[PDB]
């Protein structure tokens, strides 16, 4: 049931006395399309091994998002290093309007309609961390009413 | 019920004429800050009463000179 997605794979290098050693890193995101999403970063000598390790790591360390009918509860802002992300709930049918990393994470987390935009650096790793952080720091009417000691009707 | 303005005398060095200053508090179009703005008028004052510093009510009337088109109505806080 877990949809998985590879966002980026890069070839990093490490200069040694005998020459250069090229290894491959893979950033992947996995999610159950119904409010649970995690990201993993995997490092290996080859691309298949790197994606395998990243998929396993992302299949672990998932977190839970409070989704409202495939859309966000309210506008959220997220930030990690030099990437700042803004996500807004949108009416049904607009689809997912977001850049590549945000597109992947939201599509795998199960948000079907959202307006998004990334400011600052669009480096995929930090963009994924920031959007996941923003999705996690989002509160729903149930929890907000419980936290403030009110009913959901009282909060409207 | 007659449209009038209320300002402060800035000079009374002319015969039958004062230059008052109407101050208006207006929001800046772009930045939203409320900025103080001044408009300088020349006012005809028969009897040459009004002194510098007074608060005067002025009413717009027919032209009386090249630049004078406002006339004095009363003096408020005549104390300088």
């Amino acid at each position: 049931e877990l949809q998985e997605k590879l966002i980026a794979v890069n070839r990093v290098s490490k200069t040694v006395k005998g020459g250069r050693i090229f290894s491959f890193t893979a950033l992947t995101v996995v999610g159950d399309g119904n409010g649970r999403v995690g990201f993993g970063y995997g490092k290996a000598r080859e691309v298949p091994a790197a994606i395998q390790k990243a998929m396993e790591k992302a299949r672990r360390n998932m977190i839970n998002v409070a989704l409202n009918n495939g859309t966000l509860q309210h506008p959220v802002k997220g930030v990690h290093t030099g990437s700042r992300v803004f996500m807004q709930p949108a009416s049904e049918g607009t689809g997912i309007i977001a850049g590549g990393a945000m597109r992947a994470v939201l599509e795998v987390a199960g948000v079907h309609n959202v307006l998004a935009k990334a400011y600052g650096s669009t480096n995929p790793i930090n963009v994924v961390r920031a959007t996941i952080d923003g999705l996690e720091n989002m509160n729903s009417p149930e929890m907000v009413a419980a936290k403030r000691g009110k009913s959901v009707e009282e909060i409207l | 019920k007659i449209r009038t303005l209320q300002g402060r005398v800035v000079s009374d060095k002319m015969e039958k004429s004062i230059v008052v200053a109407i101050e208006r508090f207006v929001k800046h179009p772009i930045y939203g800050k409320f900025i103080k703005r001044t408009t300088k008028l020349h006012v005809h004052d028969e009897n040459n009463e009004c002194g510098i510093g007074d608060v005067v009510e002025i009413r717009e009337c027919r032209p009386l000179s090249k630049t004078k088109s406002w006339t004095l109505v009363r003096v408020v806080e005549k104390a300088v």
Partner: protein
Amino acid sequence: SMQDPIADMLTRIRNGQAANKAAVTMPSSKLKVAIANVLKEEGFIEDFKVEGDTKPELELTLKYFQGKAVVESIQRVSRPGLRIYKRKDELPKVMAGLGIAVVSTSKGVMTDRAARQAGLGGEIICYVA
């Protein structure tokens, strides 16, 4: 020099919540008391009180639900350098209604929901989420 006591009050609330303090204290004024009443009725602080005859001190007892602070974010909107006024139509929706903006209308200080229901505008003191 202290030129925004309301902003100072919000800053004390924010810092006390970040430092897990049970209660915070500040010099009192009637605007501060009105704001604290609004916060108490909206359920963002647990309690407030005033102690003192000549120099009243406002004490707010802060609220935590699951260890975490109740007030997630609180930001002064109208400030001495830039006053913000909104007509009844343009009153903001903070966190799409999950939070509250404190608006000072002509009938007293209230939330944006109360001002929109009463058909009034006014000054925007702060947002609370």
